[PDB]
Design a binder for these strands. Sequence first.
RNA 1: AGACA
RNA 2: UGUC
Length: 410
Amino acid sequence: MEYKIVENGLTYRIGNGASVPISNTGELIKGLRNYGPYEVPSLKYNQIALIHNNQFSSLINQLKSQISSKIDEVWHIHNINISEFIYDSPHFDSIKSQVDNAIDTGVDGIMLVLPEYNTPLYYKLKSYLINSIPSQFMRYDILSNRNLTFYVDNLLVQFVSKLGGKPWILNVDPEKGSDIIIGTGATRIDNVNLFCFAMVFKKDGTMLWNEISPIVTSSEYLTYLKSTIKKVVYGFKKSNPDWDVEKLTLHVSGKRPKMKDGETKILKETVEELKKQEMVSRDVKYAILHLNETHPFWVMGDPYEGTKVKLSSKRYLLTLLQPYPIKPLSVEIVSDNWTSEEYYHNVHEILDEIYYLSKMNWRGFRSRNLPVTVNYPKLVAGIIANVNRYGGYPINPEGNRSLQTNPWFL
RNA sequence: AGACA
RNA sequence: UGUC
Ligand SMILES: [Mg+2]
């Protein structure tokens, strides 16, 4: 066992060219207050609806005003009004109607307070909203035993993003890392049932385009996986047409058919064709990686964040979070296009990249033990699946630009 | 469904 | 079962 630590001087870029170090929520929020987030969403109506059945509850109220002052002071979204809508019974139809009222009054976003756990209701409403407008759900029974300050700080991180905002991105070296990173693969709905996903990222960690395949039979996996990728690269190029792609990386993950060696060839085929369709430089350097969780990592005898453990020249363990125990990410170099002189240098770039992408979750102020390239699609699968199992409204990427371009799944 | 181990 |  041989190991190397990721170079540990790196920063987020927020508003007005300011930088803040990572892993320090204090200086991030202070930075946001002064400089604003990297990109302030443009809202049409300057209006958010708050939809709940709580009376004149003094809780909706401290909430309301905390949302209100933070959205303005932390996020720099000005002149925002929150209108409230109240529903009789916590049943679907009753809440939906308050959704529709809100909508035809002209709202940029809906915050929806549910009373308790209730999975069929939640996924039915979320499904409706995702096709309609950016949404942030809430539970009153969680909102009651949590410190408001923590709950709102975090809640807004992802609500701002769903509104098209960009809280913060990575400060990247233009030279090092991939031009784009494609998170790809599939997750199991049922046992005969598959959906494929393909999501394109910039090395600063921002999602550019998101494509999802039809819920399809497991047999036809290798078909829609190849299909879906092409579609992401198509939709990304039409949107970024003068952007030469010389370094491509694939991040393959999710619970999918166990047909690996054949999965590999087809991703190679998918690339060669993208070359010949002049969507990617004719001499693209690329790598195809499997990222997987594994067993917790124990250093014995009496493990720093960003530690890269070489299990073999194709397999690495990468630690994403400080042990203060730790589940690392398993990263396999399944296939590549690299000369051998480069190779070692390219591996570590690609492992550094993964480590940085793990600091890029927009669900809140604490980032997941995953790179966004694996986490985001996992949250997709999350929603697509329950929308299947609970009879919600189908989610359709082709049919409008905002779903292919916004992190609706946070 | 505020999230994170 | 914990953390803010
Ligand atoms: Mg969420």
